[PDB]
């Protein structure tokens, strides 16, 4: 039955949030390896799931337009105020990006040059659970393939929300669904390889060892360094994944995930090499040092600054 909407087709069903495109570019944020749940199903219209509902998003120079599909048969309508506040928080639109870009730009000429072309890169505020298991799937992987795994994971273990066209949207599973005796085998069947072990084992560990998803919520109010350390006790969660989660889901803007790509950017575009270590390649200690470097340079929103560069390095 139900079809993916565009702003032309069904304007009655859209609400808008004042938002300069220079504070937010959907095309630089939603598929730049923060969330893996957004797809441009028709041009300049992005559809994906947010907290148990499907949205479609598009924008002009000065407005962010959105529509919500509730599925569980309700009557069709525009977004409510509450839903719009959900969306405002997801894009952390209280935070001014113009001021951050200008502050980063003032100590960093490399940034200033790349930041001209790549405005409106900001950090999503994601659900901890979805973010943890998504980034467990990120090891030795690329966005396209991670997106594939996460999709199949959600279809197989998460509640069906709605279907639009040929796309069936599922909510992100809960810990208990991922912790079960078959979960690893099923996830292997779904193409996750060794990552399947870490999904099930981390689901199991968060439940039994940490008393379930309220623990992740506690980490949101815990300090960065305590949150990071705690996450690294989990199967398949090391410094990189923990930093992704910290930055993207636990409101730690100073977290800087270091993987082979941030290594590459740091060395190529900043001329950085490990100093306080001898070993010249990536290593846990050198990776830590690189994160410290960027905090030192950019300040307590270093992770946001890094996201600009990451997002810019994905486009040629
Ligand atoms: Cl395969 C893959 C996909 C996405 C990411 N994501 C990031 C890593 C570091 N800093 C970031 N800032 N914003 C996104 C992002 C990593 C991998 Cl390893
Ligand atoms: Ni060199």
SS3 for the chain is: CCCCCCCCCCHHHCEEEECCCCCCCHHHHCCCCCCCCEEEEECCEEEEEECCEEEEEEECCCEEEEEEECCCCCCCCCCCHHHHHHHHHHCCCCCCHHHHHHHHHHHCHHHHHHHHHCCCCCCCCCCHHHHHHHHHCCCCCCHHHHHHHHHHHHHHHCCEEEEECCEEEECCCCHHHHCCCCHHHHHHHCCCCCHHHHHHHHHHHHHHHHCCCHHHHHHHHCCHHHHHHHHHCCCCCCHHHHHHHHHHHCCCCCCCCCCHHHHHHHHHHHCCCCCCCCCCCCCHHHHHHHHHHHHHHHCCCHHHHHHHHHHHHCCC
Distance, in Å, from the CA atom of 310 to the CA atom of 192, rounded to the nearest integer, reads 24
**Residue among 203, 53, 32, 256 at smallest CA distance from 195:** 203
Spacing, Cα 271 to ligand 2 middle (Å): 6
Distance, in Å, from the CA atom of 204 to the CA atom of 214, rounded to the nearest integer, reads 14
Ligand closest to CA 280: 2
Spacing, Cα 300 to ligand 1 middle (Å): 19
Ligand closest to CA 267: 2
Structurally, the chain folds into a number of domains equal to 3
38 within domain boundaries: yes
Q: What is the CATH number of the domain that holds 64?
A: 3.30.310.40
User: Is 261 annotated as a binding-site member?
Assistant: yes
122 within domain boundaries: no
Reading the block at residue 201, the tokens are 């084992």
How many residues belong to the chain? Answer: 316
Decide: 79 in ligand 1 pocket, CB within 6 A.
no
Question: Is 187 within 8 Å of 199 (Cβ atoms)?
Answer: yes
Q: Are both 16 and 63 inside the same structural domain? A: yes
**Residue minimizing CA distance to atom 13 of ligand 1:** 307
**Residue among 215, 228, 217, 222 at smallest CA distance from 255:** 228
Residue 153 sits at the vertex; the CA angle it makes with 162 and 221, to the nearest 5 degrees, is 90
Decide: 264 in ligand 1 pocket, CB within 6 A.
no
The atom of ligand 1 lying closest to the CA of 33 is: 4
Reading the block at residue 49, the tokens are 């799931």
Reading the block at residue 45, the tokens are 């219209």
**Residue minimizing CA distance to atom 7 of ligand 1:** 33
Spacing, Cα 144 to ligand 2 middle (Å): 30
**Residue minimizing CA distance to atom 10 of ligand 1:** 257
Question: Is 84 within 8 Å of 66 (Cβ atoms)?
Answer: yes
Distance, in Å, from the CA atom of 261 to the CA atom of 238, rounded to the nearest integer, reads 16
Decide: 141 in ligand 1 pocket, CB within 6 A.
yes
**Residue among 24, 11, 17 at smallest CA distance from 311:** 24
Q: Are both 176 and 293 inside the same structural domain? A: no
Q: Are both 267 and 160 inside the same structural domain? A: no
240 labelled catalytic: yes
Q: Are both 262 and 248 inside the same structural domain? A: no
Distance, in Å, from the CA atom of 205 to the CA atom of 187, rounded to the nearest integer, reads 17
Strand-pair category, 63-69 with 167-170 = unpaired
Q: Are both 238 and 141 inside the same structural domain? A: yes
Residue that finishes a domain, picked among 202, 226, 252: 252
170 within domain boundaries: yes
Experimental method: X-ray
Ligand 1, pocket-test mutation among 138, 240, 242, most atoms within 8 A of CB: 138
237 within domain boundaries: yes
Q: What is the CATH number of the domain that holds 147?
A: 1.10.340.30
Q: Compute φ and ψ for 99, nearest 5 degrees.
A: -70, -40
Question: Is 166 within 8 Å of 47 (Cβ atoms)?
Answer: no
Reading the block at residue 271, the tokens are 């001329």
Q: Are both 161 and 245 inside the same structural domain? A: yes
Q: Are both 158 and 82 inside the same structural domain? A: no
Q: Are both 4 and 64 inside the same structural domain? A: yes
Question: Is 253 within 8 Å of 303 (Cβ atoms)?
Answer: yes
Q: Are both 136 and 227 inside the same structural domain? A: yes
Question: Is 105 within 8 Å of 305 (Cβ atoms)?
Answer: no
**Residue among 137, 127, 31 at smallest CA distance from 86:** 127
Q: Are both 79 and 141 inside the same structural domain? A: no
Q: What is the CATH number of the domain that holds 268?
A: 1.10.1670.10
Sheet holding 53-59, edge to edge: 15-18, 63-69, 53-59, 45-50, 38-42
Tell me how far apart the terminal alpha carbons of the chain are, to the nearest angstrom: 39
User: Is 195 annotated as a binding-site member?
Assistant: yes
Contacting residues for 1 by C-beta, under 8 A, at least 6 apart: none
Domain assignment of residue 282, given as a range: 95-115+256-314
204 within domain boundaries: yes
Contacting residues for 214 by C-beta, under 8 A, at least 6 apart: none
Q: Are both 102 and 209 inside the same structural domain? A: no
Q: Are both 73 and 12 inside the same structural domain? A: yes
The conformational region for residue 71 under phi > 0 = left, psi -120 to 50 = alpha, else beta, is left
Contacting residues for 122 by C-beta, under 8 A, at least 6 apart: 23, 24, 29, 91, 92, 95, 97, 304, 307
Question: Is 209 within 8 Å of 189 (Cβ atoms)?
Answer: no
Burial of 290 per CB tally in 10 Å (0-12, 13-18, 19+): buried
120 within domain boundaries: no
27 within domain boundaries: yes
**Residue among 90, 86, 46, 83 at smallest CA distance from 68:** 83
121 within domain boundaries: no
The residue with tokens 């796309």 is 167
């Amino acid at each position: 039955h139900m079809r993916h909407r565009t702003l032309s087709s069904s304007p009655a069903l859209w609400a808008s949030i004042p938002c300069p495109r220079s504070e937010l570019r959907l095309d630089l944020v939603l598929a730049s390896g923060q969330s893996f749940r957004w797809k441009e199903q028709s041009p300049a219209h992005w559809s994906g799931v947010l907290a148990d509902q499907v949205w479609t998003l598009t924008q002009t120079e000065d407005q962010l337009y959105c529509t919500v599909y509730r599925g569980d048969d309700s009557q069709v309508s525009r977004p409510t105020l509450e839903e719009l506040e959900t969306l405002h928080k997801y894009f952390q639109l209280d935070v001014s990006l113009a001021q951050l870009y200008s502050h980063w730009a003032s100590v960093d000429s490399h940034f200033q040059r790349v930041a001209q072309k790549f405005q409106g890169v900001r950090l999503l505020r994601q659900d901890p659970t979805e973010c943890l298991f998504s980034f467990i799937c990120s090891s030795n992987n690329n966005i396209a393939r991670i997106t594939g795994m996460v999709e199949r994971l959600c279809q197989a273990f998460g509640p069906r929300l709605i279907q639009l066209d040929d796309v069936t949207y599922h909510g992100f599973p809960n810990l208990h669904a991922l912790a079960g005796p078959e979960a690893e085998t099923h996830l292997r069947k779904l193409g996750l390889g060794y990552r399947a072990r870490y999904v099930r084992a981390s689901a199991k560990a968060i439940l039994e060892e940490q008393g379930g998803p309220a623990w992740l919520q506690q980490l949101r109010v815990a300090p960065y360094e305590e949150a990071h350390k705690a996450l690294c006790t989990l199967p398949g969660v090391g410094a990189k994944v923990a930093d992704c989660i910290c930055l993207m889901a636990l409101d730690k803007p100073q977290a800087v995930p270091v993987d082979v790509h941030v290594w590459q950017i740091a060395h190529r575009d900043y001329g950085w090499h490990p100093k306080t270590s001898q070993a010249k390649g990536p290593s846990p200690l050198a990776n830590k040092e690189l994160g410290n470097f960027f905090r030192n340079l950019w300040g307590p929103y270093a992770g946001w600054a890094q996201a600009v560069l990451f997002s810019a390095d994905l486009r040629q």
